[PDB]
Amino acid sequence: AFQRPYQYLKRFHQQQNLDTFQYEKGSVEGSPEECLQHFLIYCGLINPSWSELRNFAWFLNCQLKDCEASIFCKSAFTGDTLRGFKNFVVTFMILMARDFATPTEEDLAPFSLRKRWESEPHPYVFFNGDHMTMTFIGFHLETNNNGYVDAINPSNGKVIKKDVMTKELFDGLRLQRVPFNIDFDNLPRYEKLERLCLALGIEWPIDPDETYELTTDNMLKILAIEMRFRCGIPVIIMGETGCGKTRLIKFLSDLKRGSVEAETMKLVKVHGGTTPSMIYSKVKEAERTAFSNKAQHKLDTILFFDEANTTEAVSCIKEILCDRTVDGEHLHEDSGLHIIAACNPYRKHSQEM
C-alpha cells in the first residue's frame, strides 16, 4: 500500500518516462527519510499528522490500483501514442487528495472552524473496476491560450491546475470516446443512474427507488463515500442532521446489493447513553452478519452509525476503523464490512438564542 505510490512518485520527482512496467513485487532500493519527505511535500499540508500521510498513501494506492485494473497501460502499449497520460493522472490524484484529506471560539478552534465546506470544487475522476473506461463528475475542462487545458467549476470560474498535459492525450481519449465534460444538470434519470452504476462497479443497474432525485452533488457525495471506504479511509461524515445522510447510504447499499432481499444496511443509532459495550456488541453482531453475507452472496454489508458524536465512546467509534480494533482485538481485514459514521458539527447558539 505504501510501496506502489512511492515507486511511482519517486520516479515522478525527477521527470522521467515510465513506459517500463512497474510493481515488480520486490523492494527496490529506498530510504526512509527520502520517501517521508517526498510524501510530505506533495500533500499540501504544512504540519501534517501521520494519519494524514497514511490516508494519502492509501488513496494513491487505491487510485493506482484502479488504474492498473483498467487496460489503459495495455492500450498505451498497443496504440504506441498515449504516453504522458500518467503525468496528468498523477497531477489529478494530487488534486483530489487535496480535495479529500488536507483539513485547515478559542476552544472550538480545532472542531468548529471548518476551512472547507461543500461550497468548494469536487473534481472527481474514477477508473471503474467493472469496465475499462473512466468517469468524471463535478468539474469541467476548458482549453487555454498556452496549448494546455485547465479545470473550471460550475456556478463560478476557477483556474486550478495550469499546465497539465499536451493535446496528444486529448486526441487519444477522444478516439476512445470517454465522457469528458458531461454536465449532469441536464441529464435524464436513466443515463445518470447508468453512469452511477458504472462508477460504483455495480452490474445490472436496477432502480431501487425512482423518487430519489439524484443531483450532481449527490454524485459527488455518494462517490466520495464509496471511494472513502474502498481505499480504506475511515468514513466520518460531518454533515448536520439537516443534510440527508441516512437515505444517501441507504440508496448506496440498495444499489450495491442489486436484487437480494438480505439485510445489508445495519443502522445503529449512536446516542449519549451508548456505553462501549453497546458498540462492541453491535459491531461484533454486524461482523458475523458480514461473514454470512460475504460467504453466501459475495456481497458487502455496511454498518452506519447515526449521530456518532453524542456518546462518550467516540474513541470506540474511532478504534473500530482508524486502527481496526474492537475492544482490544484486531478486526479481520478479510472479513468484509464497511463501517461509516455520521458526526454532527460544532457551533455555539446565537447569543440571543
How many other CB atoms are there within 10 angstroms of residue 225's CB atom? Answer: 19
d(CA 165, CA 172): 12
Q: Cell numbers of 139, please?
A: 468539474
How many angstroms separate the CA atoms of 267 and 246, rounded?
8
From the list 235, 226, 258, 221, the residue with the least C-alpha distance to 339 is: 235
> Which DSSP symbol is given to 311?
S
* Distant-in-sequence contacts of 158-161, Cβ < 8 A, 24+ apart: 158/121, 160/95, 160/121, 160/123, 161/91, 161/92, 161/95
Determination method here? Answer: cryo-EM
Helix (H, G, I), strand (E, B) or coil at 114: coil
* Cβ contact 60:2 at 8 Å: no
Question: Strand, coil or helix: what is 237?
Answer: strand
221 labelled as ligand-binding?
no
* Spatial distance between the Cα atoms of 228 and 236, rounded to a whole number of angstroms: 9
Residue 243, CB half-sphere, CA atoms under 13 Å: how many? 18
d(CA 266, CA 304): 6
Distance CA 67, CA 127 (A): 6
d(CA 169, CA 146): 16
Neighbours of 162 (CB within 10 A): 11
C-alpha–C-alpha distance, residues 149 and 166, integer Å: 8
Backbone torsions φ then ψ of 96, nearest 5 degrees: -75, -25
State which amino acid sits at residue 137.
I
- Yes or no: say if 7 and 23 are a contact pair by the CB < 8 Å rule: yes
Alpha-carbon distance 136 to 123, whole Å?
Answer: 7
Decide if 8 contacts 22 (C-beta within 8 A).
Answer: yes
**Distance from C-alpha of 199 to C-alpha of 135, rounded to nearest angstrom:** 7
CB atoms closer than 10 angstroms to residue 35: 18
Given in angstroms, what resolution was this structure solved at?
A: 3.8
Residue 318 labelled as part of a binding site: yes
- DSSP code per residue over 137-154: ES-EEEE-TTS-EEEE-T
**Could you tell me how far CA 247 lies from the centroid of its own chain?**
19
d(CA 56, CA 3): 12
C-alpha cell at 35: 520517501
Contact 153, 168 (CB under 8 A): no
327/320 Cα distance (integer angstroms) = 8
Q: What is the DSSP string of 282-294?
A: HHHHHHHHHHHHH
Torsion, CA 16, CA 21, CA 23, CA 26, rounded to 10: -90
- E strands of the chain, at which residues? 124-127, 134-137, 140-143, 149-152, 235-237, 265-269, 302-306, 325-326, 329-330, 338-342
Residue with cell 520486490: 26
Which helix (H) or strand (E) is 89 found in, with range? helix 85-100
Bridge partners of 313, per DSSP, are: none
Query: Are 46 and 33 in contact, with CB atoms under 8 Å apart?
Result: no
Distance of alpha carbon 49 from alpha carbon 154, whole angstroms: 33
